[PDB]
Amino acid sequence: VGSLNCIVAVSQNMGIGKNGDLPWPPLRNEFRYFQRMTTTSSVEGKQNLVIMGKKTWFSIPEKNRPLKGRINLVLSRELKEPPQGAHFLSRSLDDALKLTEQPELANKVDMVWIVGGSSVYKEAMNHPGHLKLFVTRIMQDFESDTFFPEIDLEKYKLLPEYPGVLSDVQEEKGIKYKFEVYEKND
Numbered sequence: 494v495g496s497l498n499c500i501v502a503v504s505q506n507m508g509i510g511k512n513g514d515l516p517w518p519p520l521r522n523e524f525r526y527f528q529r530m531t532t533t534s535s536v537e538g539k540q541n542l543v544i545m546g547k548k549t550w551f552s553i554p555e556k557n558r559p560l561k562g563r564i565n566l567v568l569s570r571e572l573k574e575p576p577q578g579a580h581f582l583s584r585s586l587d588d589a590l591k592l593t594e595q596p597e598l599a600n601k602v603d604m605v606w607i608v609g610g611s612s613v614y615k616e617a618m619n620h621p622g623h624l625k626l627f628v629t630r631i632m633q634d635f636e637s638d639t640f641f642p643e644i645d646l647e648k649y650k651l652l653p654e655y656p657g658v659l660s661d662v663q664e665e666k667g668i669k670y671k672f673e674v675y676e677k678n679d
């Protein structure tokens with residue numbers, strides 16, 4: 494794996510979660526974006542890998558687990574085998590990326606997507622090499638108990654536009670948001 498992607502939706506006060514759910518009402522098109530970005534593989538015959546923390550896994554409604562059309566990997570130091578329905582388990586991001594090299598996953602994975610939560614994003618954003626952060630800026634405050642680590646502009650650059658990503662402010666259910674893409678190469 495020579496490139497990692499992170500994807501997150503974040504409120505103005507840097508919130509990403511509240512009581513094991515999202516802080517804001519469901520945003521259908523924001524969800525469809527998440528689905529499109531994480532599911533779309535550029536290699537026929539391969540799937541993308543999604544990597545997520547334990548609480549994130551349990552935040553997904555059981556009926557939608559594992560995330561369809563993607564290989565689901567859960568991070569946990571405490572678990573001894575993957576949660577029911579997950580495909581893989583690793584104790585660290587490093588271990589997760591190494592597992593993609595092993596015989597089972599050899600030539601089955603295209604892109605790697607980190608999909609939360611806070612400590613997974615923190616480790617991923619500091620992983621060496623090319624990294625893209627797809628950040629949906631929800632343009633108002635929501636009461637939260639889980640937050641997105643601040644983006645180090647010494648390492649990351651905000652890309653002014655990006656192919657496949659809408660640039661204008663979006664609105665669903667009275668809530669304005671915009672899609673941002675950040676990138677570091679080293």
Ligand SMILES: NC(=O)C1=CN([C@@H]2O[C@H](COP(=O)(O)OP(=O)(O)OC[C@H]3O[C@@H](n4cnc5c(N)ncnc54)[C@H](OP(=O)(O)O)[C@@H]3O)[C@@H](O)[C@H]2O)C=CC1
Pocket residue numbers: 500501502503508509510511512513514515545546547548549550552568569570571572583584585586608609610611612613616639
């Ligand atoms: N707005 C958004 O884009 C998204 C929102 N969310 C929301 O965020 C909340 C969940 O996120 P959060 O509370 O941060 O929890 P996490 O999903 O990160 O789960 C935390 C647990 O995951 C394991 N873990 C986390 N980081 C690592 C790591 N770097 N290496 C190994 N194991 C790790 C640990 O499990 P253990 O203790 O077993 O070792 C830890 O206790 C929910 O409310 C969810 O709905 C989640 C994703 C996206």
Ligand SMILES: CCc1nc(N)nc(N)c1C#C[C@H](C)c1cc(OC)cc(-c2ccncc2)c1
Pocket residue numbers: 500501502513514515523524525527545549552553554557560607608609628629
């Ligand atoms: C769009 C949400 C979202 N948007 C963006 N821009 N990045 C993300 N990382 C996520 C996210 C997320 C986590 C994995 C999540 C939390 C959740 O909390 C309820 C429900 C789902 C989910 C329910 C139903 N079907 C598929 C996924 C996913």
Ligand SMILES: [Ca+2]
Pocket residue numbers: 496497498625
């Ligand atoms: Ca990439």
